[PDB]
Amino acid sequence: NKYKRIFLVVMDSVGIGEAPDAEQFGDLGSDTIGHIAEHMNGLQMPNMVKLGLGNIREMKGISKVEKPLGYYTKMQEKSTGKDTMTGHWEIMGLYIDTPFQVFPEGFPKELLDELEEKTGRKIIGNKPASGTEILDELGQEQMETGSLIVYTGADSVLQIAAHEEVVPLDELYKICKIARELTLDEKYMVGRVIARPFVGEPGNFTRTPNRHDYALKPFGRTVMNELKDSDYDVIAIGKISDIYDGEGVTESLRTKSNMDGMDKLVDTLNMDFTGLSFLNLVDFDALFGHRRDPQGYGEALQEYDARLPEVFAKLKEDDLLLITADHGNDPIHPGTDHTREYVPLLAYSPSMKEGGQELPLRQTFADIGATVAENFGVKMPEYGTSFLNEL
Ligand SMILES: [Mn+2]
Ligand SMILES: [Mn+2]
Ligand SMILES: [Mn+2]
């Protein structure tokens, strides 16, 4: 192998400006990093700048450098959707024609009617909410009736809440598996069905760690599957395992924050493995993008950037670091959905003695998967063009 280890970091939702097809999605004008940089009066990301972030595009506080540490470009999404699953599945070598749906006004009556009819249970609520706002509103009615609280969120999710002493935990799981089957339907296709058991009494409800997420498997065998099948390590960090429903994963390390994610990345740098370490930094998306909070988003990007020098210090000559994103989520954009944007790509190894250069723009996120596959000599994905030889 050219590289013994590849460290792939997805800065979830960290877009670098509207894609050519942005108008289809109502995303004209979107620019995640650029709008954050303006809000911050100049982003302080000296380490990403050293890698070549500003060579991809100049933004407030983010300038080009004469000699970027590694190679740089941006990537265009080919798949139909702009959701997390679509982006990640594309990154690992697929093409996804059918988009996952988000439901800001709640779910169609048709879906919920079928769920009632298959379960013999009433459904109440139907609408976006936090799992503490909706329990305050409807938790008592749930206890007294045995009905199911259905709700959504800013992401492609269907969430089902029931009190554990009224609807047995095992029943709630069965109901969620039924819903997972009903939602394999392009009209209603949610990324995740989520069991949200709760306990307590009116005015004091709390969700339990008995939460269960029901994900769809990727629509194809990914580069991860191929690495696992050839006895390589595939270490998933953060939401990565859930995003791929475990497919091709050999070890999974849960994280609770972006900083915890960077700690786990450092943990893998200390591991003797051969294969792929794959991190998702989700806070950008979950805490800041969807909540339209550019200040919090800017601060998180600066916290992330400050962690990078330790990573640079630990990378070996036969290590490759890849930094990218899975879509945009512009915190100054209307509504609460993702934004259809290019994503940055930075590729760095300490073995790059003369530093990096610009890569041709990547026409699909699958160029990452193709590059990983070629590095490790496993079956090449159906989609994507490797840039391994360019590095
Ligand atoms: Mn939009
Ligand atoms: Mn995402
Ligand atoms: Mn999201």
Side-chain angles (χ1 to χ4, degrees), residues 84-241:
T84 289
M85 279 147 85
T86 290
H88 285 261
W89 299 357
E90 198 175 315
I91 282 165
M92 280 295 122
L94 304 180
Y95 166 78
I96 309 301
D97 176 79
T98 312
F100 292 91
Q101 306 271 305
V102 308
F103 292 92
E105 310 310 305
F107 305 98
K109 178 157 148 59
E110 287 73 41
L111 170 65
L112 301 185
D113 284 359
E114 198 150 31
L115 191 58
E116 289 192 358
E117 207 228 32
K118 296 214 150 198
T119 59
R121 315 192 85 115
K122 308 167 212 147
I123 285 159
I124 48 169
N126 194 19
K127 211 104 214 337
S130 186
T132 110
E133 292 181 53
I134 196 49
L135 302 183
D136 280 323
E137 196 180 310
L138 295 181
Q140 190 177 316
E141 192 194 336
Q142 200 285 314
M143 283 186 82
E144 298 187 311
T145 64
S147 291
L148 299 167
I149 298 166
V150 173
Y151 66 104
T152 193
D155 276 311
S156 183
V157 297
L158 189 152
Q159 324 198 53
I160 310 178
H163 189 120
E164 291 186 3
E165 298 174 3
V166 183
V167 174
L169 206 50
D170 280 332
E171 292 296 325
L172 179 65
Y173 295 155
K174 290 206 295 194
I175 291 150
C176 289
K177 289 182 202 183
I178 288 163
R180 176 72 283 180
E181 289 311 299
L182 294 186
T183 54
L184 184 62
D185 181 323
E186 79 181 322
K187 298 172 284 170
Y188 314 133
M189 203 167 79
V190 302
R192 269 178 291 153
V193 175
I194 308 175
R196 295 289 194 169
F198 69 98
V199 296
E201 47 291 304
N204 188 207
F205 294 121
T206 52
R207 285 162 308 163
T208 61
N210 292 142
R211 197 236 261 213
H212 272 228
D213 291 35
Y214 305 86
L216 296 186
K217 288 179 180 307
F219 298 160
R221 292 189 68 79
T222 65
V223 169
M224 289 163 71
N225 286 118
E226 301 299 326
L227 292 168
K228 183 164 181 183
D229 298 355
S230 292
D231 300 326
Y232 286 106
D233 298 296
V234 185
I235 309 166
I237 306 170
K239 295 304 189 167
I240 293 298
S241 186

Side-chain angles (χ1 to χ4, degrees), residues 12-13 82-84 154-156 192 282 285-286 289-290 326-329 336-338:
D12 201 293
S13 85
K82 58 182 176 175
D83 65 88
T84 289
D155 276 311
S156 183
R192 269 178 291 153
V282 74
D285 183 70
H290 285 293
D326 60 328
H327 49 85
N329 194 353
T336 70
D337 200 352
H338 298 167

Side-chain angles (χ1 to χ4, degrees), residues 47 257-267 269 281 300-314:
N47 300 116
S257 72
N258 274 192
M259 293 304 94
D260 191 40
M262 300 296 281
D263 293 339
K264 267 54 169 173
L265 182 67
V266 170
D267 291 346
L269 283 152
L281 296 163
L301 285 162
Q302 295 175 349
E303 293 157 12
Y304 153 79
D305 193 84
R307 301 296 308 270
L308 294 171
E310 198 173 8
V311 171
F312 301 166
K314 295 176 88 63

Side-chain angles (χ1 to χ4, degrees), residues 324-346:
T324 199
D326 60 328
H327 49 85
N329 194 353
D330 185 345
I332 311 180
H333 196 76
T336 70
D337 200 352
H338 298 167
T339 45
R340 183 71 160 195
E341 294 186 50
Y342 293 105
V343 303
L345 174 58
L346 298 162

